Amino acid sequence: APWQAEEWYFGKITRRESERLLLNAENPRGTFLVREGQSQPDYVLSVSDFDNAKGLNVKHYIIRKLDSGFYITSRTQFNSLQQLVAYYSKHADGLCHRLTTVCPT
Amino acid sequence: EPQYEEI
Ligand SMILES: [Zn+2]
């Protein structure tokens, strides 16, 4: 099955809809979704983040498309988007927290 | 204009 059939891919949604869906109080740290860009073209990894000196917020990470490949920073490259999701769901590796649960619809 | 995060 294609990576777009996956429950964490929300396709074309706004930055507000992303943040409203993720900022449910019933979601743990590390709730995330992959969406299409709105401002900019590349895909976006949208994660919920609890900062002790700020509160509960949403961070947005741009998933740039390698012309060769996907990455958020040029230091960690993945051959597929599912291989990017699977890695960060195990290691923060520069994220505020590791990805734990797929965001509910 | 919107803010994204750079690792
Ligand atoms: Zn944080």
Side-chain angles (χ1 to χ4, degrees), chain A residues 24-25 27-28 30-49 51-53 55-64 66-74 76-81:
Chain A
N24 198 285
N27 291 340
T31 308
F32 75 102
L33 61 86
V34 177
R35 62 165 167 90
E36 262 169 47
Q38 174 196 347
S39 265
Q40 47 84 52
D42 288 296
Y43 295 107
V44 181
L45 172 66
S46 280
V47 199
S48 78
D49 172 32
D51 275 297
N52 281 347
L56 181 56
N57 59 72
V58 173
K59 296 307 171 163
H60 303 274
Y61 303 87
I62 284 179
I63 307 166
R64 289 171 195 110
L66 183 43
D67 268 321
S68 323
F70 298 99
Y71 64 88
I72 296 150
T73 177
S74 302
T76 319
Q77 299 190 322
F78 311 90
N79 216 64
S80 68
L81 269 196

Side-chain angles (χ1 to χ4, degrees), chain A residues 15 39-40 59-62, chain B residues 1-2 4-7:
Chain A
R15 189 180 251 247
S39 265
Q40 47 84 52
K59 296 307 171 163
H60 303 274
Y61 303 87
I62 284 179
Chain B
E1 316 86 14
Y4 296 95
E5 307 281 316
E6 183 223 311
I7 303 187

